[PDB]
Design a protein around this ligand. Structure first.
Ligand SMILES: CN(c1ccccc1)c1nccc(-c2cnn3ncccc23)n1
Length: 347
């Protein structure tokens, strides 16, 4: 018996279809699950519109985190700019049966589902560019100094289509977000999208969201994750396959440098020695993004050969932007305002 019967063994509310809450919300169905809890589809009879309700887990640590999310959402949603409409609208929140409930506008499926619908062939470069320009505008909005918000968990699952059959998107799930002054975690971001500074245990800022976006944009067009580590060591080695050893000035300041690397007598860094010399990774920098993208050979896996909107010039512009988003140095990684000025977005 958990929560007088309303909860399961995992601090989640046992969702029951057709239930009416507070003589206002008619619960249609469960639409998603997460570590935070659940999201249900409901009808708001008062405002006479469909809404999405995020049911936070009935547990203190998750509740405390969702309060941070509420503060950041309300701060973004009230800002006086047009750029704020790339962030999901939090309509209201309430406590119900000892669960914090966040009521959002109803959106459509996420960009992972969209990838699944192409059977992981990836979406067109033209559609990728549309996602990239919106996400860049969103990161610019998060970067306005009064906000200074780090999403901290950008991934295809947290970018949603507004309408299933249009290209407009919004960012959701600010559950792990923080502001530039108020960072409280060290193990952050979903692993595939985790920045080098986080893996190395170094200080981080809004630039970690730009790293995630670079990884996301490649995956949206190729259909598969750029860096699919099974654990942190595997994740760092997969980044090194594509981008080489991180530069010495970063590793010299990285608290977790020796989790992946060793410093040589001359002050240069290499990967840690592997067991009995067992070969597992491409040598550093030899898994070229130029070839992952198929810049000159018809796109990813050659699947865009003979298609418009996929010229070598297009791919070269795309690759340059991605590499600027994946700069090892968070101080020189491209920032949203300048990313928006990139030749990849000239049309
Ligand atoms: C349509 N819908 C949705 C889509 C996919 C999966 C689950 C729900 C939806 N629509 C509007 C807002 C949200 C929403 C706000 N915060 N989070 N956090 C985490 C996850 C979702 C959301 N989800």
């Amino acid at each position: 018996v958990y929560n007088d019967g309303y909860d399961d063994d995992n601090y989640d509310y046992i969702v029951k279809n057709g239930e009416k809450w507070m003589d206002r919300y008619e619960i249609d169905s469960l639409i998603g699950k997460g570590s935070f809890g659940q999201v249900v589809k409901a009808y708001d009879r008062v405002e006479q519109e469909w809404v999405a309700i995020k049911i936070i887990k009935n547990k203190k640590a998750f509740l405390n985190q969702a309060q941070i999310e509420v503060r950041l959402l309300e701060l973004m949603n009230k800002h006086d700019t047009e750029m704020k409409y790339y962030i999901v609208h939090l309509k209201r929140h309430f406590m119900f049966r000892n669960h914090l409930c966040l009521v959002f506008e109803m959106l459509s499926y996420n960009l992972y589902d969209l990838l699944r619908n192409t059977n992981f062939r990836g979406v067109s470069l033209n559609l990728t560019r549309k996602f990239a320009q919106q996400m860049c505008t969103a990161l610019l909005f998060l970067a306005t100094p009064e906000l200074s918000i780090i999403h901290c968990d950008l991934k295809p699952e947290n970018i949603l289509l507004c309408n299933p059959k249009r290209s407009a998107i919004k960012i959701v799930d600010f559950g792990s977000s923080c502001q530039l002054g108020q960072r409280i975690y060290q193990y952050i971001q979903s692993r595939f999208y985790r920045s080098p500074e986080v893996l190395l245990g170094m200080p981080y800022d809004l630039a970690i969201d730009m790293w995630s976006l670079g990884c996301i944009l490649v995956e949206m067009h190729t259909g598969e994750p750029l860096f699919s580590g099974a654990n942190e060591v595997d994740q760092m080695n997969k980044i090194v396959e594509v981008l080489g050893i991180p530069p010495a000035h970063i590793l010299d300041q990285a608290p977790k440098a020796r989790k992946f690397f060793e410093k040589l007598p001359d002050g240069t860094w290499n990967l840690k020695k592997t067991k009995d010399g067992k070969r597992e990774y491409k040598p550093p920098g030899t898994r070229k993004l130029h070839n992952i993208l198929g810049v000159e050979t018809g796109g990813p896996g050659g699947r865009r050969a003979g298609e418009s909107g996929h010229t070598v010039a297009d791919y070269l512009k795309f690759k340059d932007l991605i590499l600027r988003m994946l700069d090892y140095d968070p101080k020189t990684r491209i920032q949203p305002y300048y990313a928006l000025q990139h030749s990849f977005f000239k049309k």
